[PDB]
Design a protein around this ligand. Sequence first.
Ligand SMILES: CN(CC[C@@H](Oc1ccc(-c2ccccc2)cc1)c1ccc(F)cc1)CC(=O)O
Length: 518
Amino acid sequence: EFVLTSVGYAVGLGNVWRFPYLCYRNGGGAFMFPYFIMLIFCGIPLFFMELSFGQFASQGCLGVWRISPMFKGVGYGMMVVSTYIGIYYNVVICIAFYYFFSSMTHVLPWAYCNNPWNTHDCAGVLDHSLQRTSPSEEYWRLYVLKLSDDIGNFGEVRLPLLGCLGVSWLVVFLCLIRGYFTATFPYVVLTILFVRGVTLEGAFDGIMYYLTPQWDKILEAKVWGDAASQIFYSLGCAWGGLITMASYNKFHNNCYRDSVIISITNCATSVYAGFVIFSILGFMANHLGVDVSRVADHGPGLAFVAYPEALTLLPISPLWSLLFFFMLILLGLGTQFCLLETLVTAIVDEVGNEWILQKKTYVTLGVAVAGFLLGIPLTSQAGIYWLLLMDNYAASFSLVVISCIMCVAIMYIYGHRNYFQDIQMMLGFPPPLFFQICWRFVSPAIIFFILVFTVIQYQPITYNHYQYPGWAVAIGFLMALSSVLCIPLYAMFRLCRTDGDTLLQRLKNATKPSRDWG
Ligand SMILES: CN(CC[C@@H](Oc1ccc(-c2ccccc2)cc1)c1ccc(F)cc1)CC(=O)O
């Protein structure tokens, strides 16, 4: 039953919710081909490299950087990325909590729009007018989240969402002191949703659009940069917990097969989620009158505008809605629990002897209470504006760069021959020929090419799919740089303390693997 265990290791909210909206924003058909190219060459070998690095020396996200102590800032940068996804991941779960709790009525609220909080922009299937909105979209954009016209419009804090955030954080916190249905449940619900949709009118037009590619946007750096964003965010690379949970693996394990299987099931689940989502989008375009490419607003909420519509059409809809949103909550809670456990362990490990080690529960409460206070702005009226900016800036591309430096920290600093000999001690065979060439040359250079295009050469004002004010993009750029500046700054700190005068010969000393390594 190893496949079942590997199936539930990779499935989370990073592909059920993030992948559909990312694909729709990037065009769908023009995103899968870059996604498929990115997954095979840079993201499958990086996953294996991270797994092997964690498995060889049993150490957490940091502390394992004795292969090159000067680059210990890479591990610190990983926790900064993990922290950023630790304060807005819950808000995704909290919206699921609001949707889960609101489905207990006789009928789902997002079924008929004869409600006080709608305008005359409704089409309806169970029921002057231009660009009609789906009944589920208005219930989301006007009741679940009272939207504002700009980021600087906090206004009134949404009380029910604040309560849901408190409940979710308390549930996560109480699941840390105390310690089927986890890998087959998401697939059953996704299959049930797949039987629906594809049998509805106009669904095929929204299916090909998800598949057929356009040879016009495959050259732009935005699509390739975002494809690496999803292939890394939804795979756990550079998150920080990939190495930490790999530390508990045995020495003579088979990390190659584990990595291959986990990546394959993750990609298959992401493709299945996209296939289910785009089935509904075609039906929405057919019944609304607009085309598929303009039927849903490009933004963080697409799993809450497309999925709820599908569940409505099913017989005895409230039970199916409860099951689906409970599945989403379970996946989000599992991923958040893993992330918080890894962060708490990494923080706790490198502190003083006893006064901040035996009282691990208190520091866990402090971490679990810092996220709640930091998550209050995300639950306000201008909530998804901040979450989307945090998603698209903080944990969008840094995960690539932080990993890319890793791919250079061992192959061209530690020594690729030394690392290749190191894996041969783990297994009965040396690393496969595909991973040897891809690690050294094919993968990192590709990242650098994006770093050549998406940074300086090809960054017009068009690189903002939305229209944020100057302060918003400034804070987003600072957040993006906050998780990457930890690598050169820690190197400078090491160079300021290392013993020596030339500091060129000592640069070898500061990068030579430590005696603790092995
Ligand atoms: C897709 N999610 C990643 C889930 C998980 O990824 C795994 C990685 C590795 C192993 C594993 C464990 C033991 C042995 C072998 C492999 C399991 C799961 C992870 C969670 C938090 C992190 F910080 C990093 C990774 C994130 C999302 O939901 O977007």
